[PDB]
Amino acid sequence: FVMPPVEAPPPSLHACHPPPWLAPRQAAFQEQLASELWPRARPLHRIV
Amino acid sequence: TQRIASHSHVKGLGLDESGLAKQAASGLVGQENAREACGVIVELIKSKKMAGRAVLLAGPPGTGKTALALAIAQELGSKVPFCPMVGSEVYSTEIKKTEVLMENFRRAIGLRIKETKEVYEGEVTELTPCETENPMGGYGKTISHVIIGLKTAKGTKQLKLDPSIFESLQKERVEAGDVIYIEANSGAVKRQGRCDTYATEFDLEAEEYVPLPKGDVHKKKEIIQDVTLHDLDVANARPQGGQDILSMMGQLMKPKKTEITDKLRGEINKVVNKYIDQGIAELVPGVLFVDEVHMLDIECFTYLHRALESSIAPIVIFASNRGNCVIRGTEDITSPHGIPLDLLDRVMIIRTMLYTPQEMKQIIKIRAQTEGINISEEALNHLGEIGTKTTLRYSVQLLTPANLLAKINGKDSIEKEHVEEISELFYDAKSSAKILADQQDKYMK
Amino acid sequence: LLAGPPGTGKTALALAIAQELGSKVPFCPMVGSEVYSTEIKKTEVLMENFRRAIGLRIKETKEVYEGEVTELTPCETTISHVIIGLKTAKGTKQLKLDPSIFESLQKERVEAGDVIYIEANSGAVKRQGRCDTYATEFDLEAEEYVPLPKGDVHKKKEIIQDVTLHDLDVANARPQGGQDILSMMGQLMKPKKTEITDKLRGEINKVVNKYIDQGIAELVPGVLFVDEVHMLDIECFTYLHRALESSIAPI
Amino acid sequence: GPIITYHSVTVPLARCSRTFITFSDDATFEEWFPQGRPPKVPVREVCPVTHRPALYRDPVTDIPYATARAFKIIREAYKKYITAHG
Amino acid sequence: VTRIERIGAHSHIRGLGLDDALEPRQASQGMVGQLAARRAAGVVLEMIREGKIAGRAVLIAGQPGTGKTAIAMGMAQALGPDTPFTAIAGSEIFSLEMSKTEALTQAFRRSIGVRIKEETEIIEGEVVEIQIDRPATGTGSKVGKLTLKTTEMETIYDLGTKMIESLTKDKVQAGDVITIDKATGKISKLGRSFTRARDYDAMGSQTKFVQCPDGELQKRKEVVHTVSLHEIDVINSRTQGFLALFSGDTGEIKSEVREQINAKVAEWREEGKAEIIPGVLFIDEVHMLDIESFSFLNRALESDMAPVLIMATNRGITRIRGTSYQSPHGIPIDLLDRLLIVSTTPYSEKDTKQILRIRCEEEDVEMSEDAYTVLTRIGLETSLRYAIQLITAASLVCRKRKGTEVQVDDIKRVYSLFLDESRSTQYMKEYQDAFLFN
Amino acid sequence: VTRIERIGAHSHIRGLGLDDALEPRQASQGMVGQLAARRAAGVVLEMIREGKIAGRAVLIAGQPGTGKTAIAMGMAQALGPDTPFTAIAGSEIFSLEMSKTEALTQAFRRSIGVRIKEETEIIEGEVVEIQIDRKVGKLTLKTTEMETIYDLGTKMIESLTKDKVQAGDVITIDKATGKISKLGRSFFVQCPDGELQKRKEVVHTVSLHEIDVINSRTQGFLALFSGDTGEIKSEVREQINAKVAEWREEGKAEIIPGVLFIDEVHMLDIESFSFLNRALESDMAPVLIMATNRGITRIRGTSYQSPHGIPIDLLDRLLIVSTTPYSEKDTKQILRIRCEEEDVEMSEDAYTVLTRIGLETSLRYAIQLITAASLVCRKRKGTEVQVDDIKRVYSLFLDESRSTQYMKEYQDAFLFNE
Amino acid sequence: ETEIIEGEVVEIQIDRSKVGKLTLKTTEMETIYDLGTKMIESLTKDKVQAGDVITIDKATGKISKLGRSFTRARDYDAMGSQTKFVQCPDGELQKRKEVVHTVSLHEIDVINSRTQGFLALFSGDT
Amino acid sequence: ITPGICFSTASLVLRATDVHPLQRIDMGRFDLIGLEGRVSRYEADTFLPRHRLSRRVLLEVATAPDPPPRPKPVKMSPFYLDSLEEKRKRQRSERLERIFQLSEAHGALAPVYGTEVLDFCTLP
Ligand SMILES: Nc1ncnc2c1ncn2[C@@H]1O[C@H](COP(=O)(O)OP(=O)(O)O)[C@@H](O)[C@H]1O
Ligand SMILES: Nc1ncnc2c1ncn2[C@@H]1O[C@H](COP(=O)(O)OP(=O)(O)O)[C@@H](O)[C@H]1O
Ligand SMILES: Nc1ncnc2c1ncn2[C@@H]1O[C@H](COP(=O)(O)OP(=O)(O)O)[C@@H](O)[C@H]1O
Ligand SMILES: Nc1ncnc2c1ncn2[C@@H]1O[C@H](COP(=O)(O)OP(=O)(O)O)[C@@H](O)[C@H]1O
């Protein structure tokens, strides 16, 4: 039953003119990791 | 196994059927009283009705303490677990000292599991449903069995199985000419490939084609598996084989020993008791041998009181060559074997004495026999005289250099001259200490 | 050893030695109290600095195809090759790419009008924005618009880069890339210094010797300066006894 | 609709459990139980040149062979056949 | 066959051996003598059973071999499995994974049990006939029917898709005695009322049958769930905490998590959902704790979630670990003020003989009266533990010579074979130079 | 309303109180007396602001309660937020996450900043209509002076879809990144007035530590908030130093040297001091300011005695500023300043009594009694603190001397007396 | 000692991916192979195509790509980091591979310590 | 629920570690750990020493005409410019030299252990 008092998304790094390849690379990495690992995290659904 | 170690000649305790110790038997010479006491301890271990009993082997260095413990292990056999351990091993960078000690305690308690695995092997020749002349419900076809024909090298048998296996057969994609095995204890069909007789030299599959099974279609055997309580504890604390994210994390992350909880150990104990009551398993309480116990600190010694008082603990054998030394972890507290007096009250002390020159000569001869070395009588007497001074370990360590020197000289036996030359080439502790004292200015620190 | 009272110029003398050698010779300055790391043992720190002091000079010609993409056509037999069209201020060039670069081009999301560069030796693709000639194709897009490259599409440069043995050691301590799940999850793990094995050190030494014999590498032994060496403890000094006796160590 | 009925009953031999599977239509029964005949053992082909057991199969001529010399002879024969028949 | 639990040091202790008035019998339930200490332990046990006062500390102090651990084990056996009893050594709190205060907090919270009692509807019966109709191909709605039977009932149930899936996964057949929980749909097979058809092959050897359940089909049964505060803390600390219940590896649990759990458990207690079952933490050899641990103990006993703390020490005026201060029992005076001390006096000759008799009875060893006299003399001269060890040593020596009763000769033989601390120290003094460091 | 920043110990310090010639005033900007220390601190401030000399180290040494930390706080206030001022205690460098040398390296690099100016296009307005069709889209934005319709690209459409934007919302868009932040709704924030699309000059001052951490690994900037930096490799730091030198030479960036303040530096050990001896010799080293009240004392980690608990080799690199005890006039002026800070009214007799109490016992004890006496006065419905309130709080709260006397009276009842 | 198949890939035909054929050649030989499900999956995973010089282990079926043959149409201007051109192997398509190497006990321990334990032989994080 | 922290930094900071390809050497010539699980002892020791390409073979294949089409299975100059062509043949020579140099570079390293050794030593 224990819930954290506060819940926040991770801090985000913002630059006016970032390298245009960093964000797509991170997005692709996250997409692949989620597609490979989210099905494996389903048993922990009730705890979360 | 082929290499000769320091205790390669110890094949057990040379005890008569009445427990009296023979002067020289099973590779052991002398130490008759200690050997008799160790035989009594062996009977205690075999009785399997005592827990947490501790024995301390006390005596000067090179008096057979480790040799006696290894003789006990030889007497027990490979069936009985024997977990050797030095006191320095409790100092780990991953787990606490008490956890190391508890894990070593659980390693000594063994469990022997006996089960019968009954399987049906064969190449599927026939796959025929057994329809019923009166279909239930009036329409369609109803089946009451599925006949599976299994063919092996020396037979062929037909099995009238439950209709429910039709789903397993389809899931495994079992067809005629495939090699499958069915387990009686589970009622499941497993397809172990296709028969190799239907494979051509132009095929490229690797794990698809399997040889036709030899032997009978119905194979049953008794499986004896030996496990320890620590094996079950570790396999349950960091499980391997799951497909969830936690198992993936375990595979990814570096393995690390963890502090296994009393909850998991109690669950393992309950499962072990259930297996014992069912007749599946037989408990095999063994021995934990802790050499150089004096290297344990005061925390380890204190924990050993509770560890030994337990009803699940094995029989622990300690060994210490220290005198009135200072207990580690304490400031200027001296105890007779480096062991606090509280733990000495919980142990039975076996005393090992020094060796007479005759016993030293016998041990040297035995070691020469073990190392495949022929030594003359005069060389043996000179080496025994060398062993009267210096030590016994020094004399037994001159055998292989002297044998090599003889072989270089072109002789098949060690003569006295070879031992003299080796004694000149290599120094013992006392001679080196004399040199160091005579030249203490030229040495460092 | 530079021994003398404080303020007498030992550090200045070491820095003067470094100035006399020049920036081409590896001068690794370390303080004796820097060996007390919380990630690796002290001897590992000492050996890492020892390898830092030894330098390797590598002469290599690099080739990069750079320009705005005017055409991106994979040629089917699977894909036999990729024909790309790159534009610069000095003209247009048509290139035949190894089919393995198509995966990199698709990952980088390379379309016509994007300014990219392709490494000839590795097939690496970096999409460094859209061409500014297309900046007016929409009134509001979240795009980085980049000028058209000025020189030729094909750029050749002969370079001399200095690396140290520690750089080659740390490059082979952990794998890079990898599309497997274990490899991807390893990118999330916190980077920790590790006690690099002597097997890896020797293998890297063999590779370095191979390239020296080939003639594309040059060795610069270099200097490691340890200041406040009295902050080393007895274990560090004992390890230095062995390390200085190596045939691979620096001054 | 087309269904598969799984049925478990208690019937006297004092009682025993039996299971039955009922297929609504013969198509499902044929699909789950094709009653396939046992497969046939392939003929162990032999190289026409060296008479050793065949290990390879030239794709152009479909002639099995077991030696590089046999392959060269087979390809020479095929070239001669092309020259003659055209 | 030998179970995992064998004859240990305190296997003969089945309880404190007190009457209704907490008056110790001379010899009952394994305990012999220690009348005052056993009476005090009984009063403390009554205090534990009442479970109203939090953070009470008792110190069992005495000379080695005076029965401190025997009294603690008797208290544990008299409490019973319903009340938690966490027995640890003082050395166990020194851990590389967590702080000493965290280890002590976890030990404290392992000694308090939270019990949830709720009533659920339960169907228990013998499966007569199960029928499941499923589409031949493609996704569809499975339809089924189940018949359940008791000695006095038989009902036919129309089954839903999820109950159909549960029955299919459990592979429920006719004659299986199954239990169904209506809410969660969990199905537990507990036996077979009769055998399967004989004509089938690859079925295995049929086990014994189970009698069909009687009474009504859908009963109402009381379900009790009991966990400790530590288990709640661990499963609430992180998503992977439930695995930490077995692997340890809990790290340091946040104080926020523990405060939230204390609040939720108090709310449950007020609302009648859960009852708190306070237990005991027994720290053997508490003198291994340092000053920081003792300082934590001082204030951790002031919580209403604290259990009864029982310590054992055989130290006199000794240096406190981590300091240079001499204190009674190796314990700071601030902690000694928060606890009642139970002293154990040494045993007499008759108490020693009775303890030896109880040990022989526990070990199934038969001994003569002369052997008992000699063994009691040896125990008075050397120690009680040495004589206890000689009991089974002499049993083995007697069994070797094909005997039935342990005689004085066997005791003398084991006395010669196995040495005590005194004779070993004498022989080591005789060869002091041969031993390494003095 | 009560904000996070309440009245602290140095809340009244607003600067060093110096004129253009660095001549201290008797009472200015919350500072009283200590003319020599304040003048030396002003000279050090001029050195910091000049930014030419690297690795200069200054020690502020003096008895407890002599304005050492006050001098440091005034130095921090006189510098603006532009110049980095890293303030740590000596105990903070002892970590389980990294070594002491790594902790001091991070402390040094946190004190040097890199100021980078860049231009961005910012679109701020009120959303009128948003249309997206299966991709193409239109967006209509308005200010109080102009209205416009935009033809959207795929990436901006995705950005506007991810962050739910509907008509009436007041949003700002960074054109190059699609960074949309909703700052309210209008029909609550007033709609922007001027031009919809503005070219803005954004200036960031980034510390060397921030550059190293951001470039240490992918998503490495997260370690700037959760520790977890580990021990950053020296290769990354050398590469960053080289790139920062390249930027400075090319005009892309300016270096802003700052100040690292280590209060209670006597907590550092010999290893940390040996590291500081050579870390100050780099061209990227900031100005180091330390404070200690130790006399000739054992250096931590050794058995050697040194004048400040600091080894003599490091002391040879320091300029020492000595703080002198306060007089009756300075003590009374400090008490007046603290009373003004806490909004407490005292009588002149109360000021005299409190000054005598502070001189006899301690300035911090007297400052503490100000709030207690004010509370006692407010309890009895009074408005101005009297001598009776001061005597009441004097009796209620003891100082170190009277507490030690009472403890010595019953020393047997206390625990572990030497 | 291990039996391998070694040749240059000429054609890969897969019908529909249940069954297909693979043609391999040497400078002195050429043959066609019938593929199964796992062989087809392994070939598709490694993206084996024409002109690739590969070896296949007969016992385990694992496929490692040695290189690709050079033709007039493979005159690439940019090459990937792993592509390299090799000559077509000579001799017979079926070959025996003998590998002799010396490893220590510690290396075998590290390899079997974890799933990818051989990585610890470089990092030292054993 | 709180909004995340938006940490803003200079765009130049994100390019601090970036080095242009024309300014850095190829580190794949020292990549030993990348060969593990991909490169075998056979390739490094037996195959490549025998079947490495040579410049002569590469030039012969490039200059030679296209091979004849594989047989089907049987069941049994006014606008000519000299400068442009000279440029084109120089480009072809450079391309062939690059192919050769890259093929030699990409198979120069031998694994420390190799797939066979790891497979042999890897127990179930
Ligand atoms: N009674 C004995 N009979 C035969 N070999 C012995 C005997 N005592 C010692 N040894 C041998 O002499 C060597 C000395 O080791 P050991 O006696 O075990 O030293 P310690 O008792 O100090 O551990 C070993 O090789 C041991 O096997
Ligand atoms: N001989 C010298 N000539 C010029 N400058 C010197 C000389 N010796 C020392 N210095 C300067 O004086 C300071 C102290 O010298 P340093 O090398 O730090 O002494 P240490 O031997 O203690 O390291 C430095 O700023 C250094 O540049
Ligand atoms: N009063 C008693 N009744 C029964 N057994 C006892 C008694 N006192 C001690 N024992 C037994 O003698 C041994 C020593 O007592 P123990 O409680 O371990 O001493 P300690 O006070 O040092 O813990 C144990 O085996 C214990 O079971
Ligand atoms: N010259 C001064 N001007 C104003 N306030 C001062 C002065 N000196 C000390 N204080 C104040 O007295 C208190 C004591 O702190 P401080 O004297 O800085 O301690 P220390 O110098 O021992 O670190 C603080 O509230 C501080 O602001």
Ligand SMILES: [Mg+2]
């Ligand atoms: Mg006890």
Ligand SMILES: [Mg+2]
């Ligand atoms: Mg201060």
